[PDB]
Subunit: 487 residues, 3 copies
């Protein structure tokens, strides 16, 4: 006829994704990305972090020198992996404040040990027992020196070890608790007395407690493990009359990124910045639901199993009509575009500048959210195997508080980001419509269905001029006004 | 007249509510709902949680078997309620790590106790004291066995109790600290030694400390309470030469939805998921300002006394003018609507579809905020009666940090939700205006007061057609253009 | 001519500021303000808080009565400032739980001490040491009483001190751990022994551990410090056979806005509510990056080095054209305005009401961020000089969690406020444009460049009438319609 229809609209897909917003909880979008990492590879990767596989050893067993842990002497790690199927196979022992010594060594990151010559005179060195078998022979912990009487005497030891280095020295020592008085005399030839280990800054006094304990590996006695840190310029003084499991030297304390994790996952040859007890995970997504226990440049742990961030506009499946009534399922070149009815025929073209503007805004939002990780190393324990009381309750409370707060932040962030993304794509659709209306001026009317009725003869070249912003409204003003406002 | 005026507007109320938004701290709205529960009912509900009223007893007194607490033997609970007017009325005692044992038992949720045939030979069982009167005669704690000499002899005990069950056993035992050497000899016939209670996994050694304490209920001596947890497959060994307040058996350790609260509120016949020290509270609102100490599906504690969530549009009290100049007080059928002046007279009708769309979006937000309360049980202590130091300070810091962060989240959430509520109601008013404008095409002009001037004669049926969305602009186009563009 | 052009637009500046929004990481705005305090004055301000400079003393040395701390006796403070240069010069000692006693006293906020007469009979009072020189004479801690034998006997002490007051009494006492057995006999005339200090509610039993330790200031022995809190109506009972460093009275326990801070900053004559280890800082900004350790009405600590809050509109550098194509670099009277071309030359005038509306919304926003501060006093230790284990790990975890969450809140808040600010200035520009369009009705067309083409001769009086909202579209309707549609 003497008019034409130019409809503006946007693409749609047959199978969209349901996302949450502020306005609604179940709104369909054309595309979305998952922001919660919900699965692991099942293996701990050797790179980029140095992984020390504990095998059958615990970190403390490796520290003390348990005969099965000889392969752990002087090792370094970024993450120590402690296996569930691990056990002591040496003299029964315990550690008051076990969690603290384990934390100290895991944080330090090394078992580097330097032997020192202690003046252990008047006593017999290198005591052994059938509990600790090293090479089919009776042994003891490789980093401890079990001192016993010499010729039925155990003279009081007053042994000085100055710290003349520029680093802190970690000394591991213990106290033997015999299972009977007969053992106390056999090994030390005198009453228990007490052991005092002191520095200029601190002191520790431990008394032996002789008596039977349930046998562990047929041993009715125990060794208690104690430690001390000697600062540069300080002096370690050990005063003992018996029952001393002496240090053979010191371990270095380092500051660093090292930690310990409990995991039965195998260790494999892959590169992954994040490590969890379930194995390494990708750290692209901002959130994870694999484990609360993490090491490295990991995503933050949330309770939500899935959070999907819209990466497209509202999906609205389906004469010509535009964005007000529905989306266009026949558009594959871009997100926004034009469809028209002319004298020559019907056609369609995408508006690639508006499409890219919407994509760049989405890309910017994804860039702020994706690839930004939070690198954490030594942290509190999050899983417990014993009922300890007030301190464990506080550690659980702190972790649950952190998880609830980050889950809230993730839920609010995703709902705000999805509401904003929809608003951005609606704004781009509306800007394209307003641009077209302003370009057409008085030569077209808004039909209320996202289309313009053009009141002058319009060919495909004219539509092309409109689409790329080169339409001259004055050339057609007289025809359009005569048709629009009948005279 | 040859023309008519069709005005669009929205309701207003004589008494609005002041809410906060991001843009303005004090915006008046037609309606708002409180999101902070600031008052309790004053009573603790018997349902749905099992409530154990401690009456005159603390949890530890019920655990030990204080005579006034005999009514709590073998009881179970979901929440143990500890009264301020509670006191011990038995032998004076203390508990190292009292908070840990109280938490441990409260978390377990039961006083179920199984007696065991301990081989307490060579000693006299069931010692009593005048401090503990049961049935008007001298007694002792019902779950403790005060062992004394037999015929002026107290042979060393080496008593083994294997754990052959599939569950952990909690053994409660103590150490008697006589107030004089005469009591130590009178009761045990020998000087004090040490008590060692050990397992394959752990050991505890406690020495008696003879000496006077300020008398409590006329007793100068004290009992210290210790506990041990025996895992399946382990063995309990009690090694003692005197001063042992022996277990009579064990308590079962459970893990579940159980805790302890200090409260003086009465307990009554009601059903409420959330229990606070001030009594049960409703759990419909997302936040509460009653107490930081809660149990069950409770709203999160915030510092704000009030937070009002807008549930309506901004209140703008009042020929005809629309939403740009004011709201309409005289409209009760809906939130959005029309007023007109035509050839027949004045009139008004509400637009019910826009009203419902706004309401549905508000109800969506309300459903997101209301009734989504998260359920928490055993947590940490938040109120303290004694000055303890570093651990109490950390617990207070953790709770204050949590409260400040949730108060921030509540303030930001309400300001964002109220700003969004205003934006949605303004968007619905604007959408109704744009819809009307598009329906009218060139037959009407925007007068800048929220009204359209229609340039053709209108009857009530025509205005109704416009409200319905059935208005045909072509049958009126020639009249409206001849009048609208008259020179 | 027969037509006129009336353009609407907004100002621009030669050089704006880059801020973050939700939509983009770097948007240029005409003005922005810093919300993170990144520097201190270098001095601790004298008021409003009561500041006690520890000089060469620690809080514990001041508590015990170290000779260098006599000037701190019976003092009160809101903030105790502990210097990194502080050192002890008295008998060597330790505290089994040093952090708890230091926190306890710092929280109490006072060294007020009330002497009590204890029945220390049969023993020698006021023992001294060459380690603690007060006036060129051997002395001891001024709040401790080193008891020794009398005539080579130390009878067992059973000393009762009832609490008949209405407040909690803090008793500081200790145990001497001699360096050998000769010291134990020389001082107490008997080996070993045990000290029990008890109340109705609790008891503490400490054994001396005789033996050498590394010499500190030439003293091979140590004193361990213990404390007891006695509630009103309770009794302090001290039972000792030797090695007792007795109390001389009690310290009052209070509850209030008091704490302790470690800092080497000097104390000035400044008045500032917020104190950090680096010195006091302004507390006007909602956030700070000076230190995680704060006292008083301080901004919250964030990791961000800077956060800029837009305080103006987007900066769009600059026939005539309006806001769709460019801003106006030549408009310095307001933020929004009109520029016109008619037969009588060209001109410009600012729209003062839209400018003020945008400013009022921004000032409202600033009042929600600036000044409002959360005041905190005693907290937790955030920096450590020793490797302690599980408790230190938890304290660090809690503080890092708090910082990460507040840094998140600060980034989200600033991005939301900047995106909203941009939306506010775009909305005000669009509202002024729509207002003009509604006033002009059919007498003008929107040219798509932020300007209106008016189809009737619009003189400076017509354009002034339009700018102030007094334009009558009917007066010019016949001319404008004849020029526009014919
Ligand atoms: C205390 O009792 C325990 C257990 O009843 C004794 O330990 C047992 O000793 C025998 C050998 O005498 C072993 O065959 C058992 O396997 C041991 N069992 C356990 C659980 O240790 C212990 O010897 C007793 N102590 C004294 C001093 O008599
Ligand atoms: C140590 O002193 C306390 C308190 O001075 C003595 O306890 C008092 O003993 C008398 C009876 O001898 C009672 O009437 C008082 O009520 C007790 N008071 C308190 C606070 O317990 C205690 O007996 C003394 N001990 C020794 C061994 O002399
Ligand atoms: C135990 O050893 C320490 C250190 O080897 C002895 O302390 C030293 O004593 C001499 C005096 O005899 C002083 O000059 C040194 O400065 C001391 N050194 C330290 C580090 O304190 C201590 O005397 C010895 N104890 C016994 C009982 O022999
Ligand atoms: C979603 O976007 C990704 C690119 O990020 C693309 O590979 C994928 O095919 C898209 N899916 C849909 C349904 O549009
Ligand atoms: C662990 O111990 C078992 C025996 O209990 C042995 O068969 C296995 O090979 C050990 N593993 C390693 C890595 O040494
Ligand atoms: C003790 O054993 C170590 C090796 O662990 C050896 O170097 C040292 O000489 C031995 N000492 C004695 C006294 O046998
Ligand atoms: C401390 O060392 C001295 C000197 O050898 C000794 O006589 C004393 O018994 C030692 N004490 C302890 C507890 O080892
Ligand atoms: C990771 O391991 C924990 C502990 O076994 C388990 O609860 C969790 O479901 C696991 N997650 C995945 C993704 O395997
Ligand atoms: C716009 O499109 C028309 C027809 O497709 C073409 O002739 C014209 O050169 C184009 N202009 C620009 C700037 O791309
Ligand atoms: C606000 O809404 C509630 C229902 O949600 C209603 O009961 C109340 O009367 C309303 N108040 C006003 C002023 O509209
Ligand atoms: C609840 O009790 C606490 C005291 O434990 C009190 O401070 C608070 O104001 C009370 N709240 C209400 C709503 O009664
Ligand atoms: C609790 O103790 C009071 C006396 O203080 C007594 O009157 C009351 O009956 C007791 N209640 C129970 C349940 O034993
Ligand atoms: C001790 O008292 C309990 C109470 O149940 C009783 O069963 C037991 O037989 C008594 N034993 C002796 C030796 O009195
Ligand atoms: C443990 O029992 C044995 C049994 O002979 C005894 O000799 C030993 O002294 C006891 N120890 C304690 C601490 O009771
Ligand atoms: C139009 O609106 C009027 C209002 O009263 C109503 O009665 C009539 O049924 C409506 N018609 C349609 C087709 O919606
Ligand atoms: C920014 O605002 C401040 C007042 O807060 C004003 O003094 C300054 O001149 C403004 N700068 C610009 C470029 O507008
Ligand atoms: C601190 O001690 C030094 C001596 O080491 C002294 O010179 C200085 O004046 C002291 N400072 C104060 C404030 O007393
Ligand atoms: C101990 O010293 C104090 C210091 O104030 C003094 O008042 C008291 O009389 C002295 N007592 C003896 C016995 O020297
Ligand atoms: C407690 O005081 C009495 C007083 O007669 C004394 O005999 C006993 O040894 C004291 N005990 C301690 C631990 O001081
Ligand atoms: C404040 O002091 C800490 C510790 O010395 C330092 O790390 C930080 O950079 C300082 N900040 C400023 C603004 O001086
Ligand atoms: C508006 O401006 C015109 C021309 O400047 C002036 O004559 C008129 O009085 C002004 N009206 C108001 C209300 O300022």
């Amino acid at each position: 006829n003497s008019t034409a229809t130019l409809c503006l609209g946007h693409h749609a897909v047959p199978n969209g994704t349901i996302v949450k917003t502020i306005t609604n909880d179940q709104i369909e979008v054309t595309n979305a990305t998952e922001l919660v990492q919900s699965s692991s590879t099942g293996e701990i990767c050797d790179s980029p972090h140095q992984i020390l596989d504990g095998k059958n050893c615990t970190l403390i067993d490796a520290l003390l020198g348990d005969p099965q842990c000889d392969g752990f002497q002087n090792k370094k790690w970024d993450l120590f992996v402690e296996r569930s199927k691990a056990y002591s196979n040496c003299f029964p022992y315990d550690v008051p404040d076990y969690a603290s010594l384990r934390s100290l060594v895991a944080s330090s990151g090394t078992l580097e040990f330097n032997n020192e010559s202690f003046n252990w005179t008047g006593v017999t060195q290198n005591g052994t027992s059938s509990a600790c078998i090293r090479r089919s022979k009776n042994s003891f912990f490789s980093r401890l020196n079990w001192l016993t009487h010499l010729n039925f005497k155990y003279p009081a030891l007053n042994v000085t070890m100055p710290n003349n280095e520029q680093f802190d020295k970690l000394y591991i020592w213990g106290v033997h608790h015999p299972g009977t008085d007969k053992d106390q005399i056999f090994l030390y030839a005198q009453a228990s007395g007490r052991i005092t280990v002191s520095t200029k800054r601190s002191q520790q006094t431990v008394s032996p407690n002789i008596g039977s304990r349930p046998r562990v590996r047929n041993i009715p006695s125990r060794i208690s493990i104690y430690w001390t840190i000697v600062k540069p310029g300080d002096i370690l003084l050990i005063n003992s009359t018996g029952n001393l499991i002496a240090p053979r030297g010191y371990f270095k304390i380092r500051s660093g990124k090292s930690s310990i994790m409990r995991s039965d996952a195998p260790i494999g040859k892959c590169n992954s910045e994040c490590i969890t007890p379930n194995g390494s995970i990708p750290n692209d997504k901002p959130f994870q639901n694999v484990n609360r226990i993490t090491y490295g440049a990991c995503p933050r742990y949330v309770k939500q199993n899935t959070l999907k961030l819209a990466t497209g506009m509202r999906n609205v499946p389906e004469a010509i009509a535009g964005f007000i009534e529905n989306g266009w399922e026949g558009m594959v070149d871009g997100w926004y575009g034009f469809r028209h009815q002319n004298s020559e025929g019907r056609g369609q073209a995408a508006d690639l500048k508006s499409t890219q503007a919407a994509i760049d805004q989405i890309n910017g939002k994804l860039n702020r959210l994706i690839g930004k990780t939070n690198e954490k190393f030594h942290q509190i324990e999050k899983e417990f195997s014993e009922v300890e009381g007030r301190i464990q309750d506080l550690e659980k409370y702190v972790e649950d508080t952190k998880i609830d707060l980050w889950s809230y932040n993730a839920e609010l962030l995703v709902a705000l980001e999805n509401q904003h993304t929809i608003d951005l794509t609606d704004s781009e659709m509306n800007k394209l419509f307003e641009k077209t209306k302003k370009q057409l001026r008085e030569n077209a009317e808004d039909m209320g269905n996202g289309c313009f009725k053009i009141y002058h003869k319009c060919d495909n070249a004219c539509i092309g001029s409109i689409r790329n912003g080169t339409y001259d409204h004055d050339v057609y003003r007289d025809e359009a006004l005569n048709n629009r406002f009948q005279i």
